[PDB]
Amino acid sequence: GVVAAAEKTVLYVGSKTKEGVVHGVATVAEKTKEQVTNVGGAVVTGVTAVAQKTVEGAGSIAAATGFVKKDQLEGAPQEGILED
Amino acid sequence: GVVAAAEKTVLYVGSKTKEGVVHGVATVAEKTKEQVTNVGGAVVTGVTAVAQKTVEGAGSIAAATGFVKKDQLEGAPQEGILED
Amino acid sequence: GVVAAAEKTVLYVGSKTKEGVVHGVATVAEKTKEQVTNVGGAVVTGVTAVAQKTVEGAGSIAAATGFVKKDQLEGAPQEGILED
Amino acid sequence: GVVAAAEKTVLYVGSKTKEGVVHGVATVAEKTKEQVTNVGGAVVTGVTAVAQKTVEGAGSIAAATGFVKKDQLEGAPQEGILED
Amino acid sequence: GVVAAAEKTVLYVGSKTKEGVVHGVATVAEKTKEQVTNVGGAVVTGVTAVAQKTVEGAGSIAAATGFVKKDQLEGAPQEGILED
Amino acid sequence: GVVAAAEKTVLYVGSKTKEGVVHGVATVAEKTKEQVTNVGGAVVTGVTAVAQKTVEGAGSIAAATGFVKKDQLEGAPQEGILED
Amino acid sequence: GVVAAAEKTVLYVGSKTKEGVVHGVATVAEKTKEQVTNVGGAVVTGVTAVAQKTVEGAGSIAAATGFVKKDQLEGAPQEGILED
Amino acid sequence: GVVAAAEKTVLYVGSKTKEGVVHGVATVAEKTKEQVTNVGGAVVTGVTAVAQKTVEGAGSIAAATGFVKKDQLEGAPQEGILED
Amino acid sequence: GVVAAAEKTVLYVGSKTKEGVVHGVATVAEKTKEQVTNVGGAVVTGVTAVAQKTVEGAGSIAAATGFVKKDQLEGAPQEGILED
Amino acid sequence: GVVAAAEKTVLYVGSKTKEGVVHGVATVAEKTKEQVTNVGGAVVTGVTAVAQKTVEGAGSIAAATGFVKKDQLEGAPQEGILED
């Protein structure tokens, strides 16, 4: 793996790794408006400076699935009515 | 793995790793408005400076699933009525 | 694993690892408004400077599931009526 | 594991690890308003500077599930009526 | 495990680990307003500077579940009426 | 000056002023080193969250003058010798 | 000056002023080192959350003057010798 | 000056001024080193979140003057010798 | 000046001014090194989030003057010798 | 001046001014090195988020003058010798 060896008989020996890293982030937001309206699904908004490492599995960042329907032998409606 | 060895008979030996890390983050938010309205699902908003490491499983950050329906042998409605 | 060895017969030997870490975060929020209204699901908002490590399981940060319905042999409604 | 050895016959030997850590966080919030209204689900808001390590289980931070319904052989309604 | 050994025949040998730790946090909140209204679920707000380690179980911080309903062979309503 | 008047025959009348004010300050300092060496002058360091108001005089914050020499009818030496 | 008057024949009349004020300050310092060495002058360090008001004079915060020498009809030496 | 008047026969009347003010400041400093060496002058470093108001005088923040020499009818040396 | 008047026989009347103001500042500094060496002058470094108002005088922020010499009827040397 | 008037017999009347103001600033600095060496003059470095208003005088931010010499009826040397 990540090994460092020196055999003396100034000196520098080094091994370094980086996986899933986020450095310096600077952000300014002044006059922001955000509306979210959902009825029967999934919504993901506003994800900033996120890091991850997964070894023996599934890695997911900002993932949205509306719905999972695995039935066996009723429906699944959604109704976003808006009027004026 | 991450090993460091020196054999003397200035010296520097080093091994270093980084997995799932977030450094310096600077954020300013002045006049922000946020509305969230949901009826039958999932919503994730505003995730900042998050880190993770998972070894023998599934890693997920900011994940939204509306609903899971695994029945066996009724429905699942949602109604977001808005009027004026 | 993470090992450090030196054999003498200035010297520096070092091994260091970092997994799931968040460093210096500076945040200013001045005039912020937030509205949340949900009826039958899940909502996650405002997650900042979070770190985790999981070894033999599932790691999840800011995860939302609307509902799980695993029946066997009624419905599940939601009604967000708003008027003016 | 994390081992450090030196064999003498200035010297420095060191091994150090970090898992699930949060460093210096500075936060200012001046004039913030927050409204939360839920009827039949789950809501998580405002999570800051949180760290965790789990070894033989599931680790979750800021997780919301609306409801779990595993029946066997009625419904589950929710009604957020608002008027003006 | 975490071991440190030295064999003499200035010297420094050290091994140190950190799991689930939160360092220096500075927070100022001046004029904050917060409203929470729930009828039949779960709400978690305002979690700051929290650390945990779990070995043979499930670790969860700021987790909300609306309700668990595992019946066997009525309903579960919720009604947040607001008017003006 | 700052006056407020109301003449009735909900009401709000208000006059407010702010001069030399410092609001919410959050600061974290983790591993800081500072060396100061002076021989014949003035040094000012590390001034944070300071406010002042002066009306009929001179206002000064973090002011350094090396020396004032107003003689009338010897010298003024300084010697910062450093060696290795 | 600061006056408030109301003439009735809910009501609110108010006049308020602020001069030289410091609000909420939160500070964390973990591992800090500071060295100061002076021989013949002035040093000011580490001034935090200080307020003042002066009306008919000179206001000064964290002010350093090395020395004042107003003679009339010897010298003023300084010697910071450091060796190794 | 700053006046507010209302003449009734919801209402809001307001006058407000701000002079020399500093709002929310968030700062993180992790591994900082600072060396200062002066022999015969003035040094000012590290000034943060400072406010002032002066009316009939001179206002100065972080001002450095090496020296003032107003003689009338000897010298003023400085010697920063450094060697290796 | 700053006046607000309303004559009733929802209403909002307002007058507001801002002079010399600094709002939300977020700063992160991780691994910073700073060396200062002066012999016979003035040095100003590191000035952040500073505000001022002066009415009948001279306003100066982060001002450096090496020296003032107004003699009347000796010299003023400086010697920064560095060797290796 | 800044006046606001309304004559009733929703309404909004407003007058607002801003002079010498700095809003939201976000800054990250990770690995910065700075050397300053002066012998007989003036140096100003690192000035951030500074505001000022001056009415009947001279306003100056980050101003450097090497030296003022107004004599009347010796010299002023400077010697920055560096060798290797």
Numbering used by the authors:
A (entry chain J), B (entry chain H), C (entry chain F), D (entry chain D), E (entry chain B), F (entry chain C), ...: 14 to 22, 37 to 100, 105 to 115
Authors' text:
α-syn is a 140-amino-acid protein mainly expressed in the presynaptic termini of neurons and plays a significant role in the trafficking of synaptic vesicles and the secretion of neurotransmitters. With abnormal conformational changes, α-syn can further self-assemble into β-sheet-rich oligomeric and fibrillar interspaced structures. The transformation and aggregation of α-synuclein are characteristic causes underlying the pathogenesis of Parkinson's disease and other neurodegenerative disorders. Here, we find that a recently established α-syn fibril strain, “B”, markedly prompts the co-aggregation of tau protein in both neuronal cells and in vitro settings.
After helical reconstruction of the main fibril species using Relion 3.1, we obtained a 3D density map of the strain B fibril with an overall resolution of 2.61 Å. The fibril contains two filaments intertwined along a principal helical axis. The helical twist between α-syn subunits is −179.47° and the helical rise is 2.408 Å. From the high-resolution atomic structure model of strain B fibril, we observed the classic Greek key topology within the fibril core. This core comprised residues 37 to 100 of full-length α-synuclein (α-syn) protein, slightly larger than the wild-type (WT) α-syn fibrils (composed of residues 38–97). Notably, unlike the previously determined WT fibrils, the N-terminal and C-terminal regions of strain B fibrils are adsorbed onto and extend the fibril core. Consequently, the structure of strain B reveals the distinct structures of residues 14 to 22 (14GVVAAAEKT22, island 1) at the N-terminus and residues 105 to 115 (105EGAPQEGILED115, island 2) at the C-terminus, contributing to the elongated fibril structure of strain B. Thus, the ordered sequence of strain B fibril that we report includes residues 14 to 22, 37 to 100, and 105 to 115, forming the entire core structure. Compared to other reported polymorphs of α-synuclein fibrils, the structure of strain B possesses a common, conserved β-arch fibril core and has an identical fibril zipper interface formed by residues 50 to 57 (50HGVATVAE57) from the preNAC region. Structural analysis revealed that the C-terminal negatively charged amino acid sequence D105-E115 is involved in fibril core formation, resulting in a significantly negatively charged surface of the protofilament.
